Amino acid sequence: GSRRASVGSHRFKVHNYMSPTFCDHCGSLLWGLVKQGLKCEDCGMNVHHKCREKVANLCEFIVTD
Amino acid sequence: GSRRASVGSHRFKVHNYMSPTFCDHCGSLLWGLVKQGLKCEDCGMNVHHKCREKVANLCEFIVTD
Ligand SMILES: [Zn+2]
Ligand SMILES: [Zn+2]
Ligand SMILES: [Zn+2]
Ligand SMILES: [Zn+2]
């Protein structure tokens, strides 16, 4: 038995956060009221622009569809 | 960079083939005109009932969505 996972690399896109949100890499607040960071279009990971280069490219999530 | 793949184990279901179709494992014809074998609902692999127990469980396909 195996879960079905979607497995690729992150697809980060600049994102406008509507509530205070923290960087999933470093834990600091994503500062500002607009374009505060990047959100992975596939797995939802939120990062600072500066942290984009610090995270592993590996992007996986369980497909519960 | 990486392709994105859907990765799990096969999900075989009995299948009615509308044209002559061969087992993707052993290469012999899926005999008969109905319920000739099983098709993986995820990757499309076609197998004899008897070959279901012979194939590796690993089921992957590229997500081109
Ligand atoms: Zn991701
Ligand atoms: Zn950060
Ligand atoms: Zn399969
Ligand atoms: Zn076979």
UniProtKB/Swiss-Prot annotation, chains A, B:
It comes from the Eukaryota. The gene is Prkcd. This is Protein kinase C delta type regulatory subunit. A zinc finger (Phorbol-ester/DAG-type) spans 10-59. Signal peptide: none annotated.
